[PDB]
Amino acid sequence: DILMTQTPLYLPVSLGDQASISCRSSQTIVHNNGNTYLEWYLQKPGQSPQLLIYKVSNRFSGVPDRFSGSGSGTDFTLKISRVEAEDLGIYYCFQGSHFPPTFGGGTKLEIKEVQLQQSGPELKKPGETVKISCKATNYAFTDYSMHWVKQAPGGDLKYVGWINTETDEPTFADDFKGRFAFSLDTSTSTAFLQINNLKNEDTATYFCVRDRHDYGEIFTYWGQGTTVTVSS
């Protein structure tokens, strides 16, 4: 419902240069609790997205100060004072203030203990079913919910839903109401996402994600992802 319009789609740059990326929300994203859950993620080639900035301008632990986030209202910006080799990849802005949370389309930048382990890539024929698993390590599984995110072939990110790990109650984003189901197994500290009747539009990498919302962070720990290829 809340569109995050991210520009530019592409940012060719030479190391040493500055880079600025902007994001405009279709609606304000202040939460009734006063916080603005606007986050910025970096996805390096062959890796899962990683959190860089949360609540608009706070740098995630370990993120270098070359990265700074700013903005308010409907306009936000991530600035990289000097681009280095490890900064190349795709950047995404994200709003987690109003359900369903939404991601910007991404900006490809290029030169001119908690762990979540997911099941392996699956090649499936349409109409079939797949059950993706996500095993939580280093925290008590039922202390935090488990979230699920879909990354389509072209890289766009879409929220699937979350499952309360204590009540076993799931919640889906409108676009995933019907053929998707969440379940869990506490004996194995594992959360599952099941997809019924595999369709072409389901081909993607699905990520399970752990939040630290009580610290002000929405998507802090990402699984390595599970690619589901529907070879019709």
Partner: peptide, 6 residues
């Protein structure tokens, strides 16, 4: 804690 923001 279980997710409580929405």
């Amino acid at each position: 804690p279980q997710f409580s923001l929405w």
